[PDB]
Ligand binder design. Structure first.
Ligand SMILES: *[C@@H]1O[C@H](CO)[C@@H](O[C@@H]2O[C@H](CO)[C@@H](O[C@@H]3O[C@H](CO)[C@@H](O)[C@H](O)[C@@H]3O)[C@H](O)[C@H]2NC(C)=O)[C@H](O)[C@H]1NC(C)=O
Ligand SMILES: *[C@@H]1O[C@H](CO)[C@@H](O[C@@H]2O[C@H](CO)[C@@H](O[C@@H]3O[C@H](CO)[C@@H](O)[C@H](O)[C@@H]3O)[C@H](O)[C@H]2NC(C)=O)[C@H](O)[C@H]1NC(C)=O
Ligand SMILES: *[C@@H]1O[C@H](CO)[C@@H](O[C@@H]2O[C@H](CO)[C@@H](O[C@@H]3O[C@H](CO)[C@@H](O)[C@H](O)[C@@H]3O)[C@H](O)[C@H]2NC(C)=O)[C@H](O)[C@H]1NC(C)=O
Ligand SMILES: *[C@@H]1O[C@H](CO)[C@@H](O[C@@H]2O[C@H](CO)[C@@H](O)[C@H](O)[C@H]2NC(C)=O)[C@H](O)[C@H]1NC(C)=O
Ligand SMILES: *[C@@H]1O[C@H](CO)[C@@H](O[C@@H]2O[C@H](CO)[C@@H](O)[C@H](O)[C@H]2NC(C)=O)[C@H](O)[C@H]1NC(C)=O
Lengths: 597, 193
């Protein structure tokens, strides 16, 4: 007759009732995303509304159990997830208006087209047209046109919608006993109740800034090197002491500098590491590629893929007859149903990402015996970090040689090693200031510290100082360049990417130390290591049952995120950059601009 | 010579777990070597007698219990390891003299639309003593407040329904269970191999 016993029975009913409902919703949404028809979208929306209504009923019920009287930490967490008032704390009409503008922003982003003024018959959307320009074009004026057209068209539409989005989202979070929507987001990292492992919501800012400070020097040297190399590519357009023009960074926004590898390669004579030609020339089976990833995961002590996975997954492009969503996704449908949705091509990029998504599935396969509300990552960063450590091990030349796509020669000049590490940095460290600044601007906007009359002013002021990037043309408050990113216009938090980059190298260092690896960390392949496999499974099985701090300590020995894994991974490239920039400018002027008056 | 005695074993449909079925078997020629190369039994282990001596043994009374349960819950059909099935639905005596049989039905019990014909109990007042049933639709009320009328806030309907689709994981695919128990008596009936 205790409250705890009453709460236990309530949680049993919820778990057993919600498993099946979530399974029906997942099956319906899978049939849509793999088979776009009107019947399927209506079935998905029906199942989703049923699931949301059941969840809200259970929320009002779970709100009737006084949390403070609970002495069991696990049941308290599940109850808290259910008691979250969420959007329901908004009035009905205000919530409807918020959902309307949310879907509208998502639609205009994913559908916006810009047309070439010289030839108004050529029009491109973001994918694949505008992205192809920003990735491969070497023409400054064409790139500048692409950059300015995307922003000045779709972002201007997004501006007022985004203002209403900000104010309503902050109100909701405030009604949910938070300061703003960013604080709500910061609640994901909050730990309250476990003595010796708690971690407050202001500590994230402290840790992110304290750790970004240590990353700062490495990024500065990479920035100087890329700046000189780009000066050779766009003569008379780049100052040797100024910020980088935003439209020369490799994509529409600068989130990844991957497409700058051709312009910044240290040693052209040394061959770039690409195995695409080997895959096509070698007998390949798409089944087999995914089977090889499966063979990799079993070699470290993890289970096979399920027969349901191999039968229900979609591993090839279904063709022109069947249109599907081709964004690589790892589906955890529940009830032990695990699938991967991927329009796999025979390319090196897809090989590593197949490892990444199958890493997700193993995470998803793990912690299955946990209750429903605990079937989730330790925090928002754990799943992608796990996927990313898989792809590094698969990307190592030792693994590539052992699988048989590479020549047995294995030539490894100190220059081939620096080439690989430089390509890693364009991706890994190029995204961190972007990630840190976007969430910092968003957090500040939610806090009400950036007035409406200076959204773009503070955005580009912050742009210059942190990332070292300067706009090619001036933007007044009519523009809305922040809303021009997918994650921003689709209501997704972004700090997971900063946090996941650090977590992944912590895990990589730990598992390579477990595998008794001796050489440079970036040459480590955790293949054939049942010890490393067990240490990772020991963390995977917790789900969201234990605090993420306790789970991280269980594997790496530290209660918090650490930068030394990343810095030790990139130490050789760091010294090489420090030598390469002796006669180069280090730092950035906050005052240089491409444009004048 | 009158009883194939497996009109239970292979048939059209079975009963739910909370209302498991009993049947008497008599006047039979128990040959179970043809069932050794049958559809592979998910689990076939005997407790009181030897599987290499079955047909030689000529016991008196035999009873058959048939019902359907999920895949992860199947390993509870044994003395001890009390759980959801082993307490609220079907418990086995600690001293058990018999054998347990189970196999997998791929799409027999599973249909594309889904099968919602098998039920199971989740809420009961007490654990069931061996070989007991309680099919009562008594609205369970652990909280002191006895609604007793209908579905309530702290009240719950004690019977839930299995959902069986042809794409489920192995952990909860439809497993079909038959239990053989030989009561220990000093009175003879007609059974042997
Ligand atoms: C908070 O409540 C949960 C219940 O949801 C507690 O977890 C449970 O721990 C008990 C004791 O270890 C488990 O019982 C055992 O089950 C095994 C099953 O094989 C049985 O053989 C044992 O004799 C025993 O009865 C129970 O299964 C387990 N439940 C879950 C869902 O994990 C938890 O311990 C509580 N927190 C604290 C701090 O006590
Ligand atoms: C990367 O590998 C290359 C070789 O594979 C390393 O280069 C070598 O560097 C040494 C100096 O550390 C050079 O030695 C010197 O030779 C000059 C005459 O050429 C002499 O005047 C000096 O007193 C000194 O003895 C050596 O020639 C050079 N070899 C080649 C083939 O370039 C390089 O140091 C490695 N880089 C790193 C960061 O380890
Ligand atoms: C229940 O399951 C099936 C009916 O779906 C029956 O199983 C099989 O029945 C066939 C005949 O229809 C057996 O073939 C036979 O093989 C033996 C040698 O093994 C041969 O001597 C016979 O002349 C005949 O060709 C098949 O073996 C048999 N499989 C098993 C389980 O042994 C089964 O008899 C049904 N029984 C009941 C009680 O429902
Ligand atoms: C995509 O959805 C359609 C229905 O909207 C599925 O239907 C097919 O049409 C009839 C429907 O009874 C089936 O008998 C056909 O066999 C299906 N056509 C095929 C398989 O080409 C269709 O199956 C769905 N596609 C996928 C890949 O799930
Ligand atoms: C890591 O695991 C792979 C599994 O593919 C091992 O590869 C096999 O290696 C042995 C010994 O050289 C060969 O006889 C097999 O034919 C290989 N199987 C393949 C290539 O599929 C590899 O040796 C392991 N590396 C170790 C243990 O250091």
């Amino acid at each position: 007759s205790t409250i705890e016993e009453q709460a236990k029975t309530f949680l049993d009913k919820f778990n057993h009732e919600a498993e099946d409902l979530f399974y029906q919703s997942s099956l319906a949404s899978w049939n849509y995303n793999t088979n776009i028809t009107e019947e399927n979208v209506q079935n998905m929306n029906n199942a989703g509304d049923k699931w949301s209504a059941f969840l809200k009923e259970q929320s009002t019920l779970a709100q009737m159990y006084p949390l403070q009287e609970i002495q069991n930490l696990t049941v308290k967490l599940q109850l808290q997830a259910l008691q979250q008032n969420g959007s329901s704390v908004l009035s009905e009409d205000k919530s409807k208006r918020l959902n309307t503008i949310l879907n509208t922003m998502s639609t205009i982003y994913s559908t916006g087209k810009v047309c070439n003024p010289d030839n108004p018959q050529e029009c491109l959307l973001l994918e694949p047209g505008l992205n192809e320009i920003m990735a491969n074009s070497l023409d400054y004026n064409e790139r500048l046109w692409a950059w300015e057209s995307w922003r000045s068209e779709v972002g201007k539409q997004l501006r007022p919608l985004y203002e209403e989005y900000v104010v309503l989202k902050n109100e909701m979070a405030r009604a949910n006993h938070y300061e703003d929507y960013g604080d709500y987001w910061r609640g994901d990292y909050e730990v309250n109740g476990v003595d010796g492992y708690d971690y407050s919501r202001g500590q994230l800012i402290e840790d992110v800034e304290h750790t970004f400070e240590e990353i700062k020097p490495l990024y500065e040297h990479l920035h100087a090197y890329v700046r000189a190399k780009l000066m050779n590519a766009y003569p008379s357009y780049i100052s040797p002491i100024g910020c980088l023009p935003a439209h020369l960074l490799g994509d529409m926004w600068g989130r990844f500098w991957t497409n700058l590898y051709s312009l910044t390669v240290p040693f052209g004579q040394k061959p770039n590491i690409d195995v695409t030609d080997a895959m096509v020339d070698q007998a390949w089976d798409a089944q087999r590629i995914f089977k090889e990833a499966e063979k990799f995961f079993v070699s470290v002590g993890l289970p096979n893929m399920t027969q349901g996975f191999w039968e229900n997954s979609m591993l090839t492009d279904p063709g022109n007859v069947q249109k599907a969503v081709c964004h690589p996704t790892a589906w955890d449908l529940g009830k032990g149903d695990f699938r991967i949705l991927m329009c796999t091509k025979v390319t090196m990029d897809d090989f590593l990402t197949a490892h990444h998504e199958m890493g997700h599935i193993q995470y998803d396969m793990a912690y299955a015996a946990q209750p429903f509300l605990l079937r989730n990552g330790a925090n928002e960063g754990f799943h992608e970090a796990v996927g990313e450590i898989m792809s590094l091990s698969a990307a190592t030349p030792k693994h590539l040689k052992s699988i048989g796509l590479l020549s047995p020669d294995f030539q490894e000049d100190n220059e081939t090693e620096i080439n690989f590490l430089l390509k890693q940095a364009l991706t890994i460290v190029g995204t961190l200031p972007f990630t840190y600044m976007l969430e910092k601007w968003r957090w500040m906007v939610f806090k009400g510290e950036i007035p409406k009359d200076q959204w773009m002013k503070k955005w580009w002021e912050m742009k210059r100082e942190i990332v070292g990037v300067v706009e090619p043309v001036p933007h007044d408050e009519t523009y809305c360049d922040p809303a021009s990113l997918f994650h921003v216009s689709n209501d997704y938090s972004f700090i997971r990417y900063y946090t996941r980059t650090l977590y992944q190298f912590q895990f990589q260092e730990a598992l390579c130390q477990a595998a008794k690896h001796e050489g440079p960390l970036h040459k480590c392949d955790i293949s054939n290591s049942t010890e490393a496999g067990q240490k990772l499974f020991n963390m995977l099985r917790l789900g969201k049952s234990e605090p993420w701090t306790l789970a991280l300590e269980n594997v790496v020995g530290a209660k918090n995120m650490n930068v030394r894994p990343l810095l030790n991974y990139f130490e050789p490239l760091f010294t090489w950059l420090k030598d390469q920039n002796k006669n180069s400018f280090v730092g950035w002027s906050t005052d240089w601009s491409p444009y004048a008056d | 010579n009158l009883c194939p005695f497996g009109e239970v074993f292979n048939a059209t449909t079975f009963a739910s777990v909370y209302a498991w079925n009993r049947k008497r078997i008599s006047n039979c020629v128990a040959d179970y070597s043809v069932l050794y190369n049958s559809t592979s039994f998910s689990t076939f282990k005997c407790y009181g007698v030897s599987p290499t001596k079955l047909n030689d043994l000529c016991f008196t009374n035999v009873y058959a219990d048939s019902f359907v349960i999920t895949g992860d819950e199947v390993r509870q059909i044994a003395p001890g390891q009390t759980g959801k099935i082993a307490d609220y639905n079907y418990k086995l005596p600690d001293d058990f003299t018999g054998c347990v049989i189970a196999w997998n039905s791929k799409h027999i019990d599973a249909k594309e639309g889904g099968n919602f014909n098998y039920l199971y109990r989740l809420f009961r007042k007490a654990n069931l003593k061996p070989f007991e049933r309680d099919i009562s639709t008594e609205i369970y009320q652990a909280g002191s407040k006895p609604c007793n009328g209908q579905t309530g806030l702290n009240c719950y309907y004690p019977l839930y329904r299995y959902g069986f689709y042809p794409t489920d994981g192995v952990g909860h695919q439809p497993y079909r269970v038959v239990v053989l128990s030989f009561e220990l008596l000093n009175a003879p009936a007609t059974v042997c191999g």
